[PDB]
Design a protein around this ligand. Structure first.
Ligand SMILES: [Zn+2]
Ligand SMILES: [Zn+2]
Ligand SMILES: [Zn+2]
Ligand SMILES: [Zn+2]
Lengths: 262, 262
C-alpha cells in the first residue's frame, strides 16, 4: 500500500516508506536547460532531454526529506536548490556536500557518516566508485567523478531498499548486498560514457544480469536513463536485454512518473 | 623526535610525525602463539613465525596513540589488548570496531568517519577492499574479509604518509593517491592467499611496480611479510622483484625493528 517508489526522471524519484517520503537526487531543470556534458558520449545533445512528468507542485507535495547521493548536476541542480523548501532535512554523503548545500540556504543538512535514523527509518551509507580503476588513475577524469554514495533504507516490516547510486560494480556493492540483503534494488543503469574510454562511470545491462543472479528474490528497478546526454544505454536497450534473458519478472524499467508498489 | 617509520613485525609499526608517535596495527604475540589461519595458504604453519624485534618498552614507551585499521588477529591481538595502556587514544574505522575495543577496556576510542585531528596531525580515512570482487561475492569468504581502512597522515611541514592498509588495488587507492599526493607510502605486500582462490586479499609485487609507476617520487615502504602463515610473497620475493625492475631506490623493505628516516 503506502510503501512505494515513484520514478521522476533520470535518478530523481520519490521513495515512500511508511509516512515518510524521500525525494532522491533531484535534478529538476526544464528540458534542454543545459548543453551535454563536455567530453562525454553524445555531448552535442542538450539535457535533460525530456521535461518532468509532473508539475512542480505535485512533485514537491508530500516530500518529508531529501536524499542527495552526490552533487553532480544530474542529481542536484539549481532548479532543485530554488524549489525545495529550505527547511526540509537533506541527507548527504560527506562534509563537502553538507558545506555546499548549507551555503545554498538549506538549514537542516545531515551527513550520513555510517547510519542515521529518521522517523523510524534507518539510512545506511554504502560505498561506490563512480568509474573504473583506470578512470580514477586519470588525473583529468578522476576529480570529475568524485565520491558518490548509495543508501540502504530499513524500517520495521518494510522491504529493505538499496539505492545503489552512481557506482560501477565493486566490492562495496557486494558488501551492501550480503550485509543488508535488500528486497528492492534501485540501480542506475544508463551506462554513462566518456569519450576515449571503453567502460562506464555507472552501471548497465551487465550489472542488471549480475544483480538478478546475486539476488534472485529482489525487485530490481532500473533508472538513470533517457535523460542526460551521455547515458549510452536506454530503456529500450534494457528492455531488450531483460526480455532476451528471461528476467523481466525480476527487473522493472519504470517510465518517468510511474509508481511501483514495494 | 624526528619524523620516521620504525617497522616492528608484519603490519605493526611505529610512525613518528610532528613529535607524535602512532603505534600501527599491533599484533604482538610471541612466536607460534597461534595456529595458521584456517582455510588459507600454508595453513599448517603457526604464527607469528618470528618473535618481536624489540622489548615491549622500546615498543610502547614513546607511543602517543594507536591506529587500528581493522581487528583481524594479525592487526590486533590479545597480547596488544593486555599490554597497551588502556588510556591510549585508539583510532578505529567504524562503530563495530569501537564497540569491540571499548569492550576490551580501552576508554578513549575514536572513529575516523572522515578525518580526525590529533596533536596537530590530520588522520584521513581511506577506502579499501580486503579481497577481489569475486571474493566478496562468496558468502563464506566475504564476512571473514570484512572492512579495513587505510589512513593518510598529514601535518604542516611534514611528509604526507599513506598507510594503504589491507586492500587490493581499487579506485579507493587511486582516489587517495591523487587527492592527497602522499610522499611516503606504506604498503601491505605479503600477498596473503586463501585456499581455492587465485588472487590475494592484500597487495603483492604487481602493486609495488604499479605504485612506483604512479608515484615515482614517493618513498615506498613494503611490509606485512614473513610473519603470518598465508602471505605467499616474502621479503626475498620483493627484493628480487625490485632489483630485477631497477626500482630499489623507490622501495624499502625494512627488517623487523628497522627505522627509516622520512
Ligand atoms: Zn554522478
Ligand atoms: Zn549520474
Ligand atoms: Zn586483514
Ligand atoms: Zn593483514
Amino acid at each position: 500500500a503506502m510503501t512505494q517508489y515513484t520514478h521522476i526522471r533520470n535518478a530523481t524519484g520519490k521513495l515512500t516508506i511508511k509516512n515518510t517520503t524521500f525525494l532522491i537526487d533531484p535534478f529538476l531543470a526544464p528540458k534542454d536547460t543545459y548543453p551535454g556534458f563536455e567530453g562525454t558520449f553524445n555531448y552535442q545533445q542538450r539535457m535533460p532531454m525530456v521535461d518532468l512528468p509532473l508539475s512542480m507542485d505535485d512533485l514537491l507535495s508530500n516530500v518529508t526529506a531529501v536524499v542527495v547521493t552526490h552533487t553532480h548536476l544530474d542529481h542536484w541542480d539549481d532548479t532543485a536548490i530554488n524549489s525545495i523548501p529550505k527547511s526540509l532535512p537533506i541527507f548527504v554523503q560527506n562534509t563537502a556536500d553538507k558545506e555546499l548545500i548549507t551555503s545554498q540556504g538549506f538549514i537542516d543538512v545531515r551527513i550520513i557518516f555510517e547510519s542515521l535514523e529518521f522517523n523510524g527509518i534507518t539510512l545506511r551509507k554504502t560505498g561506490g566508485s563512480h568509474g573504473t580503476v583506470e578512470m580514477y588513475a586519470n588525473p583529468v577524469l578522476a576529480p570529475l567523478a568524485g565520491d558518490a554514495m548509495g543508501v540502504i533504507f530499513e524500517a520495521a516490516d518494510e522491504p529493505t531498499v538499496y539505492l545503489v547510486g552512481d557506482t560501477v560494480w565493486t566490492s562495496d556493492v557486494e558488501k551492501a548486498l550480503l550485509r543488508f540483503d535488500p528486497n528492492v534494488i534501485i540501480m542506475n543503469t544508463g551506462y554513462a560514457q566518456i569519450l576515449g574510454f571503453e567502460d562506464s562511470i555507472i552501471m548497465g545491462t551487465k550489472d542488471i544480469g549480475r544483480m538478478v543472479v546475486r539476488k534472485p528474490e529482489a525487485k530490481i528497478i532500473a533508472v538513470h536513463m533517457d535523460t542526460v546526454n551521455h547515458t549510452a544505454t536506454s530503456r529500450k536497450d534494457v528492455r531488450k536485454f531483460i526480455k532476451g534473458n528471461n528476467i523481466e519478472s525480476h527487473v522493472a524499467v519504470p517510465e518517468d512518473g510511474e509508481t511501483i508498489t514495494l
